[PDB]
UniProtKB/Swiss-Prot annotation, chain A:
Annotated compartments: Nucleus, Nucleolus
Domain of life from the UniProt record: Eukaryota
Phosphoserine modifications at: S27
Role played: DNA-dependent RNA polymerases catalyze the transcription of DNA into RNA using the four ribonucleoside triphosphates as substrates. Component of RNA polymerase I (Pol I) which synthesizes ribosomal RNA precursors. Besides, RNA polymerase I has intrinsic RNA cleavage activity. The heterodimer formed by RPA34 and RPA49 stimulates transcript elongation by Pol I. Subunit RPA49 can bind both single-stranded and double-stranded DNA.
Name this protein carries in UniProt: DNA-directed RNA polymerase I subunit RPA49
Swiss-Prot record, chain B:
Full-sequence range covered: 288 to 344 of 1203
Protein name: DNA-directed RNA polymerase I subunit RPA135
Other information: Three distinct zinc-containing RNA polymerases are found in eukaryotic nuclei: polymerase I for the ribosomal RNA precursor, polymerase II for the mRNA precursor, and polymerase III for 5S and tRNA genes. Present with 14100 molecules/cell in log phase SD medium.
Protein family: Belongs to the RNA polymerase beta chain family.
Purpose: DNA-dependent RNA polymerases catalyze the transcription of DNA into RNA using the four ribonucleoside triphosphates as substrates. Component of RNA polymerase I (Pol I) which synthesizes ribosomal RNA precursors. Besides, RNA polymerase I has intrinsic RNA cleavage activity. RPA190 and RPA135 both contribute to the polymerase catalytic activity and together form the Pol I active center. In addition, subunit RPA12 contributes a catalytic zinc ribbon that is required for RNA cleavage by Pol I.
Upper lineage: Eukaryota, Fungi, Dikarya, Ascomycota, Saccharomycotina
Species of the source: Saccharomyces cerevisiae (strain ATCC 204508 / S288c)
Compartments where located: Nucleus, Nucleolus
Swiss-Prot record, chain C:
Protein name: DNA-directed RNA polymerase I subunit RPA12
Region feature (Necessary and sufficient for recruitment into Pol I): 1-65
Binding residue positions for Zn(2+) 1: C9, C12, C29, C32
Species for this entry: Saccharomyces cerevisiae (strain ATCC 204508 / S288c)
Family: Belongs to the archaeal RpoM/eukaryotic RPA12/RPB9/RPC11 RNA polymerase family.
Region feature Interaction with RPA2, mapped onto this chain: 1-59
GO molecular function: DNA-directed RNA polymerase activity; nucleic acid binding; RNA polymerase II-specific DNA-binding transcription factor binding; zinc ion binding
UniProtKB/Swiss-Prot annotation, chain D:
Annotated compartments: Nucleus, Nucleolus
Cited function: DNA-dependent RNA polymerases catalyze the transcription of DNA into RNA using the four ribonucleoside triphosphates as substrates. Component of RNA polymerase I (Pol I) which synthesizes ribosomal RNA precursors. Besides, RNA polymerase I has intrinsic RNA cleavage activity. RPA190 and RPA135 both contribute to the polymerase catalytic activity and together form the Pol I active center. In addition, subunit RPA12 contributes a catalytic zinc ribbon that is required for RNA cleavage by Pol I.
Family per similarity comment: Belongs to the RNA polymerase beta' chain family.
Protein name stated in the entry: DNA-directed RNA polymerase I subunit RPA190
Annotated gene: RPA190
Organism of derivation: Saccharomyces cerevisiae (strain ATCC 204508 / S288c)
Subunit structure of this chain's protein: Component of the RNA polymerase I (Pol I) complex consisting of 14 subunits: RPA135, RPA190, RPC40, RPA14, RPB5, RPO26, RPA43, RPB8, RPA12, RPB10, RPC19, RPC10, RPA49 and RPA34. The complex is composed of a horseshoe-shaped core containing ten subunits (RPA135, RPA190, RPB5, RPO26, RPB8, RPB10, RPC10, RPA12, RPC19 and RPC40) where RPA135 and RPA190 form the DNA-binding cleft. Outside of the core, RPA14 and RPA43 form the stalk that mediates interactions with transcription initiation factors and newly synthesized RNA.
Other remarks in the entry: Present with 2840 molecules/cell in log phase SD medium.
Amino acid sequence: SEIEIESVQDQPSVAVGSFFKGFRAPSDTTFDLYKKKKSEKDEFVLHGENERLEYEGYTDSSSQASNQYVVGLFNPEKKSIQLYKAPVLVSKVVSKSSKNLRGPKI
Amino acid sequence: IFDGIIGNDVKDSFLTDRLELLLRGFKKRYPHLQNRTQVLQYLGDKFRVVFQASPDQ
Amino acid sequence: SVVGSLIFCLDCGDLLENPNAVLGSNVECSQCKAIYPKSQFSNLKVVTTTADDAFPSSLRAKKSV
Amino acid sequence: RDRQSAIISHHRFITKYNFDDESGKWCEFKLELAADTEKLLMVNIVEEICRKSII
Ligand SMILES: [Zn+2]
């Protein structure tokens, strides 16, 4: 009893993102993908904006370099997986209120 | 921070409640520290007299 | 999100002001602007218990062996 | 019911009082406080009063 692998896709397409417990975002929120083609591997960066906040996520390069994440979609009935390499991105969300500051001194 | 502390441990009423006292209590004391930058300004501003870094920072 | 007796803003994750204390039938976040005391309202309860330590006794000692 | 109502009448915070009169196995009473009460560690308060009550 072992599951067979049907297909593997090796180039950027799907991504995975860590967020606060409760992230839901607008029905239309958009996620900008980036690709910093750095030497051997391309460290990725995600960036989005909404009406109040803007969310930016990135990979933990020193842990990214030592472990790599893969996501696949399996069908029980076709015994087939469409494999996708996906970056896991630890994303933080800043708001418009998070962009105000005081004087440079007292 | 909550997920950082309790995580999957959502069942510790002991910890859920102490942590509600901590986070809600901080929200009580400093309602105007709304983002990290303001907080940093409060720490630098409140210790600038003692870190000997003056107008130089 | 609501956890235990904490309810966090669903959009921004801020531990928004408790529905029980709002001056409206709908409060909002201090980071973003979401509507909550108005939407789903919660029924905040916690089953708090003793740590099974505060109450030493000979009878507890007869319960421990 | 007269006991519970009388104890409410003796104490400003308490609301209900159900007692296992069949043995004494538990003592339940409901305490209601205004929103303005914010937060306390009620378990810890109970513990402290438990070690301060003497039969
Ligand atoms: Zn919020």
